[PDB]
Design a protein that fits this description.
- This is part of a larger assembly, with chains A and B.
- Chain A is mainly beta.
- Chain A has no helices and two strands.
- The radius of gyration of chain A is 27 Å and the shape is rod-shaped.
- By secondary structure, chain B is low in regular secondary structure.
- Chain B is 7% helix and 6% strand.
- Chain B contains one helix and two strands.
- The longest helix of chain B has 5 residues.
- The relative contact order of chain B is 0.13.
- The chains are: A mainly beta, B little secondary structure.
- The chains hardly touch.
- The structure holds one RNA strand.
- Chain B: This is Small ribosomal subunit protein eS31.
- Chain B: It comes from Candida albicans (strain SC5314 / ATCC MYA-2876) (Yeast).
- Chain A: Belongs to the universal ribosomal protein uS3 family.
RNA sequence: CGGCACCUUACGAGAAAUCAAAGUCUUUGGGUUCUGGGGGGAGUAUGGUCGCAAGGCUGAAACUUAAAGGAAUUGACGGAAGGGCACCACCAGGAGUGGAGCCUGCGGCUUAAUUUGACUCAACACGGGGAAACUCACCAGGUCCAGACACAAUAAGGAUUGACAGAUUGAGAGCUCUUUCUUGAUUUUGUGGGUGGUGGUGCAUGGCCGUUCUUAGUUGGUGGAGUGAUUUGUCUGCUUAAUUGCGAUAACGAACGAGACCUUAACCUACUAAAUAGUGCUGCUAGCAUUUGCUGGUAUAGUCACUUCUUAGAGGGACUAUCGAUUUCAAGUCGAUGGAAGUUUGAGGCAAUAACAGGUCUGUGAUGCCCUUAGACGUUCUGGGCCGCACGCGCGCUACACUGACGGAGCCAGCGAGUAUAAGCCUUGGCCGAGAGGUCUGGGAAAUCUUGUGAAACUCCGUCGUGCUGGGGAUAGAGCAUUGUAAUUGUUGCUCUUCAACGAGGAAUUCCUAGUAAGCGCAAGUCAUCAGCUUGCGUUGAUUACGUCCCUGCCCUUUGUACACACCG
């Protein structure tokens, strides 16, 4: 999260502005690349067919 | 807050600043002339020629040099 | 067949609550009686009538008033109910505070001024607010423009600048005055207009911070319910520190908060290393006994080795792991064992939605509007004040002693900080001085020097001997030093002398569950000087719970409400 706060000068008085922009963790080139509690599990490599017991010398 | 800020009362009288005194055509009475033919001058190395003293109580004093003699 | 009812539905009705009639009513007509027409005045007055009476029946008007009222919704509140929770709650206790003296802040009073903000928690050692000057905003006085710029005027035959000597002034301010000298179109004067302000308004604001409330809470999409406000999701039960989980399920999928996370503490003879850490050896060497021993100094060139202790990257480790039990046997929970660690392992940083007329305009060259702007509310200098004292209050420090005071001796931490042509940093060692301090050197911009910060409580050996006593050290006299331009209204330190109150503190009331409380110091912040204050840090190290909802509050559900400025209604 990066934050910018500015003062706005108006004829009646100052207005305050706050902008908060959250970036994508996956697009973070500096520190962490994911949120701390975000868990990624790999896709399975299963439902495969197996040939009883040959050997390739 | 401030209790109806005091309206100044002045024990002393109104005081007046100082303008510059006038002296018409000073160089006229600076120099002496006779037909068909002057106070003093500062001798300090600050200015040199072209500065006039005054005639106080037997005392001299210029203005471009704050020095007194005799 | 008749009757007293009930349950479900809601086609239908209704503002809804609800209704088998309160349905068959704008698609408005089966018969018929009675009653109402905003709220009050008022079922009052008057007349009549009935009554033994009490009263009953009939029954106005003047005048007054913008709502009153019904049903439901969300919240809030309840001396309502049911669940759960907290040492800013209690219980069992510890230390106390409240009582004294003093330090400090607040009110009051005084004042020339004693600047000012804040008043339950959530004002009162708070404004980092320990003010001699400055700070500084207040008070008595004296300067200066640092009033941009554009006009207009004056004016070079002078717009204007300063300053010797006196007088003058607190002042060696040419501020002002006598004085003729100096300088020269940057300036002076009037207009327009700027600028500054710790001036006002925090009830005009931004930002920040505090609080509600540091609990478990908060929100939309689509779908379901409701004419609507709204509601379900977001929940009976069990469980958790937890809206956190198991699950239940008119929802389903999600978002925030919680948790995860980050910092820090504890373990690692497991990696990488160390001449700014430490060590084993080895030279050279000390004293003491000679067994080849015991304790040391030394060598950052000893052209040695190493990493247990120290440092810090890069990792490992805890996940409730094992075993008994119990419980939807799901989530969990309780005992042991092992383990450095088994309360989420200990401590923190971070922290949702809605809000408050909470605080701050005196942090800000953050600001709108108002005010003021040359005898200034700008700025600066001198001096005073913020400390002023019949009195009330808050945070504290010293104590009232023998579990002690004094004198000797022993002798152990941890977090930290530090400068140069100064306006001057941390200071070892040597010398002088009773001390406080002075002086000369040298090290250190720092794991290198200060510094093993040799801290204080504490431990040992004596003196004192139950008394306001050698407990306590306020108040005061005299003297010596240091900081500062300046110590008077004692800045602070030191020496002698003076030697108060206080004998454990009424009603009340605070904080706290383990390396915690209490006690004890140290460093850093403020800082020329000054710490009885804060923020951290270690040293010594407990008593008592490990529970509850009685008090004070908090969360959720049900329920009542004539409350919504929300019971301080």
């Amino acid at each position: 999260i990066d934050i910018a706060i500015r003062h706005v000068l108006m004829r009646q008085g100052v207005l305050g502005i706050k902008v908060k922009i959250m970036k994508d963790p996956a697009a973070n080139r500096f520190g962490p690349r994911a949120l701390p509690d975000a868990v990624k599990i790999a896709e399975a490599k299963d439902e495969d067919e197996v040939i009883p017991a040959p050997t390739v010398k | 807050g401030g209790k109806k800020r005091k309206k100044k009362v002045y024990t002393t009288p109104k005081k007046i600043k100082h303008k510059h005194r006038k002296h018409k055509l000073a160089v006229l009475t600076y120099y002496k002339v006779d037909n068909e033919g002057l106070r003093r001058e500062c001798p300090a190395p600050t200015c040199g020629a072209g500065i006039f003293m005054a005639n106080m109580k037997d005392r001299q004093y210029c203005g471009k040099c704050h020095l007194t003699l005799k």
